[PDB]
Amino acid sequence: RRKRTAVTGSQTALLLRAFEKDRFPGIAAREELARETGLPESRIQIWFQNRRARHPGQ
């Protein structure tokens, strides 16, 4: 178990917008999102994975 990352409302909103542009960001795009959101890139990867599995689109 790693410590569960607290994702804020504003962070979620920014991730949802990037998801609309590309559902499979590569590591460079994820590192950009990491810098923009404050989340570690590793956590952005997991966020996108879960999003794809649970709420694709909309």
Author numbering: 2 to 59
Lines from the paper:
The HD2 domain folds into a global domain of three helices, α1–α3, respectively. The N-terminal poly-Arg/Lys motif, perpendicular to the helix α1, engages the DNA binding. In current HD2-DNAERG structure, the QNR motif is also the major DNA-code-reading module. Taken together, the new DUX4HD2-DNAERG structure shed new insight into the DUX4-DRE recognition: (1) DUX4 HD1-HD2 might bind preferentially to the repetitive DNA sequences containing 5′-GATXXGAT-3′, 5′-TAATXTAAT-3′ and 5-TGAT/TAAT-5′ (the complementary chain is underlined) motifs.
